[PDB]
Amino acid sequence: APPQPVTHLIFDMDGLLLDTERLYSVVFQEICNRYDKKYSWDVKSLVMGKKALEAAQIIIDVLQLPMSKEELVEESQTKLKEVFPTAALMPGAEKLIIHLRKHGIPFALATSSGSASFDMKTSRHKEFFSLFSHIVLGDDPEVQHGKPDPDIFLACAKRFSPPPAMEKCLVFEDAPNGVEAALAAGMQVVMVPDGNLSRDLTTKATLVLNSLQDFQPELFGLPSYE
Numbered sequence: 234a235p236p237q238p239v240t241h242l243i244f245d246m247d248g249l250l251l252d253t254e255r256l257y258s259v260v261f262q263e264i265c266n267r268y269d270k271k272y273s274w275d276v277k278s279l280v281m282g283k284k285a286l287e288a289a290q291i292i293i294d295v296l297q298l299p300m301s302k303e304e305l306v307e308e309s310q311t312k313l314k315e316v317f318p319t320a321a322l323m324p325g326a327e328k329l330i331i332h333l334r335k336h337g338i339p340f341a342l343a344t345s346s347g348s349a350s351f352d353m354k355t356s357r358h359k360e361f362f363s364l365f366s367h368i369v370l371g372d373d374p375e376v377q378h379g380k381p382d383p384d385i386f387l388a389c390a391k392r393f394s395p396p397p398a399m400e401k402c403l404v405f406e407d408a409p410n411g412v413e414a415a416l417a418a419g420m421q422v423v424m425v426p427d428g429n430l431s432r433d434l435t436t437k438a439t440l441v442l443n444s445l446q447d448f449q450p451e452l453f454g455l456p457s458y459e
């Protein structure tokens with residue numbers, strides 16, 4: 234389906250705006266290794282976009298780890314707290330966000346991350362995160378499940394003033410679960426996947442790019458870059 238114009242943008246955070254997926258990978262690989270299991274791309278593809286407890290349970294079931302989801306979340310979060318503040322902005326993120334703000338294009342953030350995790354990750358990028366119209370987190374009372382449930386994107390769109398039709402919203406995602414949540418919400422979606430993700434998991438989005446740097450806003454009826 235050819236790209237159609239949009240008026241409101243919704244961004245994922247982890248792996249899309251910030252380089253935090255490699256932080257999760259290292260902590261989960263370290264935990265999995267002690268059980269002689271490999272935290273591989275196949276497993277990672279299943280859990281990006283899930284809430285922390287959801288992700289933990291999947292890791293445990295798929296890799297048959299001898300722990301509870303609460304135990305895996307506690308241990309992993311304890312380790313991640315030391316590195317999350319070092320999160321860096323992904324290529325193209327700043328350019329795109331500043332462009333939208335300048336042309337008055339509303340945009341918002343919809344992340345399955347909880348409050349503390351979000352605070353840590355964005356603690357050193359406050360000027361970037363202040364430009365978003367609003368933020369929905371995974372611990373929001375309105376979000377019952379992580380992506381691919383559309384809850385989080387629907388909640389996000391309904392909080393713009395005035396609220397757009399879902400079909401005029403464009404999601405940006407790095408994860409398959411997030412592309413599926415956007416489609417389930419009735420929204421178009423730009424995917425910027427890691428190249429290690431499978432072909433099957435990277436061929437569902439409206440547009441698939443190697444980098445945010447390659448996004449051409451005019452394809453979606455937005456102002457071109459000056």
Ligand SMILES: O=c1[nH]cc([C@@H]2O[C@H](CO)[C@@H](O)[C@H]2O)c(=O)[nH]1
Nearest residue numbers: 247257281282283284285288346
């Ligand atoms: O490798 C991983 N990446 C991401 C998550 C989860 O998804 C959210 C962001 O992708 C994050 O909050 C965590 O629950 C995970 O558990 N493991």
Ligand SMILES: [Mg+2]
Nearest residue numbers: 245247248407
């Ligand atoms: Mg993501």
